[PDB]
Amino acid sequence: DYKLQYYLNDYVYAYFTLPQEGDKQQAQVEHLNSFYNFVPDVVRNPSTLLDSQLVTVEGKVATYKVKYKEMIEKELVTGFNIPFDEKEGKYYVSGLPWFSA
């Protein structure tokens, strides 16, 4: 579904672009949290997104293949699983994501 991909593309971008600057980080966390329909209870490291590709959608879990890099440059690749739902015609992220091979 194209609409789902447009929506989750923004979420994936936010997730994998935590900045280095502490003051920007506080706001970026709040921006990422805006995709959830809940406020997370209190970990991401500074990152840049290189590529993302929606691989499968099973039920209400979208699985992406994400290529990103930290700054510690090795390119990292992971599966990234996002639970989602819809309210009044608009998608939201329904739980914190999890990583897979």
Residue numbers in the entry: 92 to 133, 139 to 168, 176 to 204
What did the publication describing this PDB structure actually write?
In this study, we combined structural, biochemical and biophysical approaches to study OrfG, a protein that belongs to Conj-T4SS of ICESt3 from Streptococcus thermophilus. A structural analysis revealed that the OrfG central domain adopts a NTF2-like fold and likely presents more structural similarities with VirB8-like proteins TcpC and TraM from Gram-positive bacteria than Gram-negative VirB8 proteins. Consequently, we propose that OrfG operates as a VirB8-like protein in the conjugative apparatus of ICESt3. Biochemical and biophysical characterizations of purified OrfG soluble domain and its central and C-terminal subdomains indicated that they are mainly monomeric in solution but able to form an unprecedented 6-mer oligomers.
To overcome these technical issues, and based on the secondary structure prediction of OrfG as well as the sequence alignment between OrfG and TcpC, we chose to express and purify to homogeneity the separate central (OrfG64–204: from Ser64 to Ala204) and C-terminal (OrfG223–331: from Ala223 to Asp331) subdomains. Crystallization trials conducted on both forms resulted in suitable tetragonal crystals for OrfG64–204 while no positive result was obtained for OrfG223–331. Experimental phases were determined by using a single-wavelength anomalous dispersion method on crystals soaked with an osmium derivative. A native crystal allowed final model refinement to 1.75 Å resolution (R free = 20.8%). The polypeptide chain adopts an alpha + beta fold, composed of two α-helices named α 1 and α 2, followed by a β-sheet of four strands (β1–β4), the last of which has a marked disruption into two subparts β4a and β4b. Indeed, OrfG64–204 has no α 3 (replaced by an unobservable region) and a strand β4 that clearly splits in two short portions β4a and β4b separated by a bulge that ends with Pro200. Note that the electron density of OrfG central domain displayed a blob that remained unassigned despite attempts to fit various compounds in it. This density was located between β4 and the C-terminal end of α1. Surprisingly, the electron density of OrfG central domain displayed an unassigned blob nicely docked in a pocket localized in a hydrophobic cavity that shares intriguing similarity with the groove identified in Gram-negative VirB8 proteins. Thus, the localization of this groove suggests a probable oligomerization inhibition site for OrfG.
